[PDB]
Amino acid sequence: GPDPLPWCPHLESVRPVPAGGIDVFQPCEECGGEAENWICLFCYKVLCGRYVNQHMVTHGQESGHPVVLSFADLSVWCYACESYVHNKVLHEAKNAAHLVKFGEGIHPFN
Ligand code: NI
Ligand code: NI
Ligand SMILES: [Zn+2]
Ligand SMILES: [Zn+2]
Ligand SMILES: [Zn+2]
């Protein structure tokens, strides 16, 4: 991706990863779209991206939850900043998604 912001003012809208973790195989909760899905890092709803039916950007506006994670490449987008963001706050969510997607953590045990 492009060089992300190292921080943004919306990182408080990043909540703990739920007990069930981040399952990258979930389709869009609104249209059932199978690919290009994103997960909201506030409420962990799974909705399609801008290349599908724009359900995540709609949710982001209606809820005021601006920080979302991509199932396709595990990048994190902020709607309020209109930018990719990378910060330690996002480490847990990126690792949880990587664990389901690739069967191991970002830094596996030796
Ligand atoms: Ni990092
Ligand atoms: Ni990896
Ligand atoms: Zn949300
Ligand atoms: Zn959708
Ligand atoms: Zn932001």
Residue 63 C-alpha to ligand 5 middle, in angstroms?
A: 15
Give the ligand at the shortest distance from the Cα of 45: 3
Lookup: tokens for 9: 């003012």
The total number of residues written for the chain in this structure: 110
Residue 19 neighbours by CB under 8 Å, 6+ apart: none
State phi, psi for 92 to the nearest 5 degrees: -65, -50
C-alpha atoms less than 13 angstroms from C-alpha of 40 in its C-beta half-sphere: 23
- Whole-angstrom CA distances from 103 to 17, 56, 106 are 17, 26, 10
Residue 96 C-alpha to ligand 1 middle, in angstroms?
A: 14
Residue 12 neighbours by CB under 8 Å, 6+ apart: none
* Residue 107 assigned as binding residue: no
Number of domains in the chain: 1
CATH number of the domain encompassing residue 49: 3.30.40.10
- Give me the sign of the Cα torsion angle 109, 25, 53, 13: negative
Query: What is the residue range of 29's domain?
Result: 1-110
* Residue 55 assigned as binding residue: yes
Tell me the structure's resolution in angstroms, rounded to a single decimal. 1.9
